[PDB]
Amino acid sequence: DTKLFLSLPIDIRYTVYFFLGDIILTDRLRVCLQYEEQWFSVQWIVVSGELEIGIFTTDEQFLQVSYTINEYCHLLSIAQQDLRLGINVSDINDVNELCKEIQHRWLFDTVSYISFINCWDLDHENVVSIIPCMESFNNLHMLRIESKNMFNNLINTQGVRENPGKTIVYNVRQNIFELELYTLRDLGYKSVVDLQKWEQLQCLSLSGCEFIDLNNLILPQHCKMLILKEVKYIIWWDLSHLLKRIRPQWIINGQVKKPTKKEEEEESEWYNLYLEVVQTYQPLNFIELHNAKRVKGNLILPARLVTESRIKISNGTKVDSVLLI
Amino acid sequence: QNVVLVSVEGERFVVDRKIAERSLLLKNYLQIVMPVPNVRSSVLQKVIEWAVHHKDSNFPDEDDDDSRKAAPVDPWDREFLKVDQEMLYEIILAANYLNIKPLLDAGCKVVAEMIRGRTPEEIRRT
Amino acid sequence: NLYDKKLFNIWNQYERLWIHDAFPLDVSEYNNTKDFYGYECLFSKESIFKILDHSLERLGWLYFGFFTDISELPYQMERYWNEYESMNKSADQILWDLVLRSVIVMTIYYMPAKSILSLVDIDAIEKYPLELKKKYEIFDYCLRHTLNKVLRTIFTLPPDVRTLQIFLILSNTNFLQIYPSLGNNILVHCIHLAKVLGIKDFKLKINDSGSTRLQKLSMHNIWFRLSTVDYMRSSPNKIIALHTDNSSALTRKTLIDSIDVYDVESNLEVLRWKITSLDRDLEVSEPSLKTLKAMKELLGLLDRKTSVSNDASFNTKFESFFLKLQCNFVMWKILRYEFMQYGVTNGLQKLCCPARRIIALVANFLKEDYFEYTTHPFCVHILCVIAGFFSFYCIFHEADEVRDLRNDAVGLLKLLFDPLRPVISCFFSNLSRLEELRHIWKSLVHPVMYVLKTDIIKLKRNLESSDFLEVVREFN
Amino acid sequence: NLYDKKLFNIWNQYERLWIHDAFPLDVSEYNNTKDFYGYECLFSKESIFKILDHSLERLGWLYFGFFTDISELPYQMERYWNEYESMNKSADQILWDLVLRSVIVMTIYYMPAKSILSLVDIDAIEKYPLELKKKYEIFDYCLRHTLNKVLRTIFTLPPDVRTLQIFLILSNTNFLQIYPSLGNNILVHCIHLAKVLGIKDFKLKINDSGSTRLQKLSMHNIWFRLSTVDYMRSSPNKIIALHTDNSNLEVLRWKITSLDRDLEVSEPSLKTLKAMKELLGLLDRKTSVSNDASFNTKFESFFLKLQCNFVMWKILRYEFMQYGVTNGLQKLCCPARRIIALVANFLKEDYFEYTTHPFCVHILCVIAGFFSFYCIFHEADEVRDLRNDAVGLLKLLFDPLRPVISCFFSNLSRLEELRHIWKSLVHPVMYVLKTDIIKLKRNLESSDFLEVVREFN
């Protein structure tokens, strides 16, 4: 029933709605907003020249409903409730420009997230519209990308160009602490992955691909939070010379240590080895995996981090060469 | 080994130790009688009924949310939970009180099944 | 419920203002002060070596964490005594003198009474100003002499690391809770010395020496202890601080000199700072609920890692006691925040369990004849806030559970504690005023909550039948 | 010419490390050292009131700027004297005592020798340890006694504003360039007191009374002077600061200092420099609005014009160094001549004592540095003549800052020998300057014959 459901605390209803990933719905969106809106992607839209706020799936953003600002703001407390946006074949340029000018004129520009679900061409007016328009769009830190062609033709900065309105202003590249990306086959196969211009980043998200190597990946400072979701086999760092460094003088149970202060040869070697090991993973402190089903590259890790929940694998357990320091 | 548990009405029910050490609150509270405030007799009786049906069974983790939502609703549990809403909510409440998660998750699963398998006449009542 | 949430917020400010609660202003009073240290003076070198032996036996933790090598200390001591004998200056010798003086004083504070009383000489009691009252009095006389010496030699000196050690050696004492403005100023000076010497460069490098490793380790221990106190003693009388230069261990989603953690080391000072950062992110920064779920997971994990440590000797008991105490305290604060602001179910009883845990712990550490170990002031601050909240929600709401817990804590703390006389006396007296407020409220924009609104207004302005209600306001 | 720009950047680092260049250990050698104030002790109160008259006449500037009311000072003085005469404590009385002592010591620093030498008692000279040398020795003994008194009493007292007044009253002295680390720590404590008291709340609000306005004015001037010193005295021995919370002509002094900061620390542009220079010309207009009618006014306007032309010299230097416009050597030399005309005016008027403020000395140090540099690397008799005037002036005139100028002078004479070297391309001379900065950095924690002459020096 309804009020009997609503006479209850928040955690029970949270787990219920988690399983179910309308007053039902109003409490649903209260608590989903309260904790985390990983479930429902929620952004602005216009139909008939009339603005509304539509609420979507996350993967490809099929709509469910939309509702009015004043309805939603009587439902809740009005504010600069920070929010999202995503451009499609539905949402390109004039609706994008209309929302821009109306958020300037009638309203203010409260929205953060931007999404590139469609428009892999870098073309047909969406990029053309939006690249001038980011200046009055200032709460953000957060972005979604789809295609490797777009990533190669926009993001991977080896392909430097001189197309100023075609690409971002770089003051925005400062103000993008988070990132999201999906939807390609072979990122790192002989690739040019290098992102030092992408500065003041602090969190990355990846999902849904078929291949990766991490030796190809070179990165800025300040970014350590890595989220990675269900993919195919991975080429981890090789560490084969560093495997060759090792002796079985010390090896126990998947861990190693020198207790002997006197053995400055092996003690110094141990610390050299540990510091090489973190130097491989130097700008990184946190990894999340959903089931990716294979990793190839002779894993040897630190024990500080796996004793905590930093190295957070699901059971993509097709690997044996695991070890700790 | 066995331990006593007081239904707050006053009923000093008894369970085997380790079959209750399945629980987490109890496993910490010990680490023989224990109170159980705001819990009734048949409530705890059916709780222990599930607890004893599900002793040797595997339960994945409190983090594997995909396998969690990988949802085999157990038929024994499913028929066992063919009860009213209020007793059911009380079961769920005491499950939250005890940190015994799979029973709790199954209760939420079936309430989700109720409010999924719905009619618009449920809404036209509203 | 919403009234409840509001008065809980008011309790938050009221505990801040509770807790932000003689020295002669002029050093020349202590110009001609004798000693406690000389050969004929008070404390008899042979005994002093025993005091240091007691210190290494029991209380290695502190200075074992700081220094590199520790046979250094008796070595330096014997050198000092030989030189003082030959004399019947420099920087190094004066520094080490102050170090040994401070180390001694810490050891005095964590000694038992009868031992020191047997140790001390006799006739100098007749010379000097004069049970535990003798202990804490002679301790105070020692401290003020030390502080004369150290203030002078603090300022008129180069910057050396050893000064920091002195303050960190002294901070685990009544000092900062008896001489707080002084402690804040000298803390500011020590912060300046910290950022001078680049002790953020514990960031370990390739193919350094074991000595170099130990040096960087010492810096690391120093850094995190200092971040601990700089958080913990951050009343609005101070505004400068260093705890921002570290980073939260929380792994937020919503967001160079700024250190990150998890990239360094795992020595338990790390763990203490992690716990304190969780307290920080609770108090001053964005309260969420998913955040608290993650914090609670992480902290249960860390208590597991704590209890993995095993019983072998007094120091180890002491350390793991202190950490588990911290962890249950922080869990209590989290669950307070939950049950107050959002009121999820069962949290009151689940909150009551850690408190029972703490009280069992301190009762155990009494029963083992380690009452002296109890007197670390952090424990006292913990019991202070516990008694505060328990009094509050006892007078507003009924539970013989809560009454029993509060009665245990207050009878404990009342019957036992000499040293912290001003703080405890102020606390007990205003607590008794709140008990009178119980009788009042037993006798909803209530006048009682209005009275507490008046009290916070009184305190904020102190930084720089309503007739009868005002009358009892006058009465208390 | 590109080589000139690179060597100019090397010279930037070398002047930085120039400017980043006995008192006991236990405050107990001075436990019983004699006073210089009592009735029979040295200085004879009636004379002290004349010293104060000289101070208020000539040097209102500082403490007219700071306090609320200044008749309070003779008032408090005579109150202490009455109390002293009755006595033959508290916080207030000790601070006001320390205030007047510091005031006096500043006045000693800006007095002529003959008058003070006539004022001092004779047999108390015979009691005590012993021209300008006598003057600066008695000044040092005054300073150190005062420092003894203040060091004890600083830590043990609540945060009150008057401590700040003490430190800023004493900053205009040799003090902070002879006992620098000491000065940095006491500065840090004063910074702590500043952020305590909320003296960034000089934002003057509506319906504030006159007393509140004067309080905020005092607060306003103090905070900005404090930020001024905190930028100017910001070597690596201190790192905590209040010259970042930024972005009546005390404001103007801070503006000028912030322009110097933006020059030294951050973005080299040219439109920025053009606007800055224009703004400084606007402030020179506002500067010369101040008409001359009294000694303190001449002193103030002297120091302001000095600051303005100094910063213009730095800006125009930075342009000519970074981007190399033509005629800038002459356009840089002219401000220096302007500075020298000012100090010439203040010598000729028998106001030499006012010249002795250390900021002027720091200015001439950096000027003589760069002039010697570009004289050895390039030829212009104008720059040689100005440099010769500066060093002859500075040697002939400056006794209190004896070690630093002498160290600089000795190394300056060493640099004159480097002229002969260069006079005798990754040149060896620029490689020698690379070696020299490396020596300094490692101190901070025919190349055979070139190293041989280096070994000679």
* Alpha-carbon distances of C369 from A12, C116, C414, rounded to whole Å: 47, 16, 19
CB burial of D87-120 (b: ≥16 within 10 Å; e: otherwise) equals eeeeeeebbbbbbbbbbbbbbbbbbeeeebeebb
| CA–CA gap between residue C374 and residue C113 (Å, rounded) | 14
Residue closest to D164 by CA, chosen among D76, D77, D230: D230
Amino acid at A16: V
Best C262, C299, C344 residue to mutate vs chain A (most A CBs within 10 Å) = C262
Largest CA distance in chain A: 80
Least Cα separation, residue C261 to chain A (angstroms): 9
Beta-carbon separation of B85 and A1 below 8 A: yes
- Of the candidates C392, C390, C396, C424, the residue with the CA atom closest to the CA atom of residue C409: C390
Residue pair C452/C10 in contact (Cβ under 8 Å)? The answer is yes
- Contact indicator for C268, C316 with CB cutoff of 8 Å: no
CA distance D84 to C11: 51
Mention every residue, 6+ apart, whose C-beta is less than 8 A from residue D189: C185, C188, C189, D154
Token digits of residue D319: 């342009």
Residue type, C274: K
A254: phi then psi, degrees, rounded to nearest 5? 80, 20
Which residues make beta-bridge pairs with A226?
A: A204, A287
Strand (E) or helix (H) holding A287: strand A286-289
C349 touches chain B (CB under 8 A): yes
In the complex, which subunits touch A with 3 or more CB pairs below 8 angstroms? B, C
Strand partners, A63: A56
What's the burial of D438, exposed, middle or buried (CB within 10 Å: 0-12/13-18/19+)?
A: exposed
* C-beta separation of A184 from A209 below 8 A: yes
CA A20 to chain centre: 23
Rg (CA), chain B: 16
A257, two tokens: 């240590």
Between C and D, how many CB-CB pairs are < 8 A? 93
List the chains bordering chain D where 3 or more Cβ pairs fall under 8 Å: C
Closest CB from C345, C349, C353 relative to B96: C345
Contacts of A34 in chain C (CB under 8 A): 289
- CB within 8 Å: A12 and B109: no
* Phi, psi (deg, nearest 5) at residue A289: -125, 125
- Taking CB atoms and an 8 Å limit, are C263 and A285 in contact across chains? yes
What values do phi and psi take at D409, rounded to 5? -65, -40
Q: Do A22 and B112 touch (CB under 8 A)?
A: no
B abuts C (3+ Cβ pairs < 8 Å): yes
Neighboring chain A residues of B108 at a CB cutoff of 8 Å: 12, 15-16, 19
Please give the Cα distance from D147 to D140 (Å, whole number). 10
Q: Does A16 touch chain B (CB under 8 A)?
A: yes
Contact A9 C343 (CB under 8 A): yes
Task: Answer yes or no: do A20 and B109 touch at CB < 8 A.
Answer: no
End-to-end CA distance of chain D: 29
Q: Which of B69, B92, B96 sits opposite A19 (nearest CB)?
A: B69
Report strand pairing: A143-145 vs A180-181.
parallel
Q: Which residues of C touch A32 (CB under 8 A)?
A: none
Strand partners, A255: A252
CA C310, CA C316: separation in Å to the nearest integer?
8
User: Tokens for D153?
Assistant: 């009493």
In chain B, residues with a C-beta closer than 8 Å to the C-beta of C345 are: 93, 96-97
| Closest-CA residue to D151 (of D170, D132, D137) | D170
Judged by DSSP in three states, A255 sits in: strand
* Beta-carbon separation of C345 and B37 below 8 A: no
Q: Give chains near C: 3+ CB pairs under 8 A.
A: A, B, D
Q: In terms of DSSP bridges, do strands A225-228 and A203-206 run parallel, antiparallel, or are they unpaired?
A: parallel
For residue B89, give the nearest of A4, A15, A314 by CB distance.
A4
Instruction: Determine the residue of chain B that is closest to C300 in CA distance.
Output: B28
Tracing tokens 């709460």 back to the chain, one arrives at A139
Residue contact D181–C158, C-beta within 8 A:
yes
Nearest-Cα distance to chain D for C320, in Å, is: 36
Contacts of D136 (CB under 8 A, 6+ apart): D399, D400
Nearest-angstrom CA–CA distance, A231 and A206: 9
Closest CB to B96: pick one of C346, C349, C353.
C346
Distance from CA of C350 to the nearest CA of B (A): 9
Q: Minimal CA–CA distance to A89: which of A112, A119, A62?
A: A119
Nearest to D431 by CA among D18, D3, D21: D3
Residue type, B10: G
- Contact between A113 and A43 under an 8 Å Cβ cutoff? The reply is yes
Cα angle for residues C49, C50, C52 (degrees, 5° grid): 65
Q: Do C345 and B97 touch (CB under 8 A)?
A: yes
In whole angstroms, give the CA distance from residue A165 to residue A129: 9
**Number of inter-chain CB pairs under 8 A, A vs B:** 39
Query: What is the biggest distance separating any 2 CA atoms in chain C, rounded to whole angstroms?
Result: 78
The rounded distance, in Å, linking the Cα atoms of C335 and C339 is 6
Distance (Å) of CA D87 to CA C27, D41, D75, D79, D84: 20, 16, 18, 12, 5
Closest partner residue to A271 (CB to CB) among C213, C251, C301 is: C213
The verdict on a CB contact (< 8 Å) between C260 and A308 is: no
CB atoms inside a 10 Å sphere around CB C410: 19
D238: closest CA of chain C, how far (Å)? 6
Q: What's the gap in Å between the CA of C27 and the closest CA on chain D? A: 6
Rg of chain D's alpha carbons, rounded to an integer? 24
CA distances from B123 to B27, B118, C88, D441 (A): 44, 9, 98, 79
Please indicate the experimental technique that yielded this structure: cryo-EM
* B54/B103 Cα distance (integer angstroms): 9
With CB atoms and an 8 Å threshold, state whether C256 touches A285.
Answer: no
* Dihedral angle sign, alpha carbons of residues C453, C454, C457, C459: negative
Fold of the domain spanning B1-126: Potassium Channel Kv1.1; Chain A (3.30.710)
Whether residues D188 and C192 touch (CB distance < 8 A) is answered with yes
Smallest Cα–Cα separation from B29: which of D412, C311, A198, C357? C357
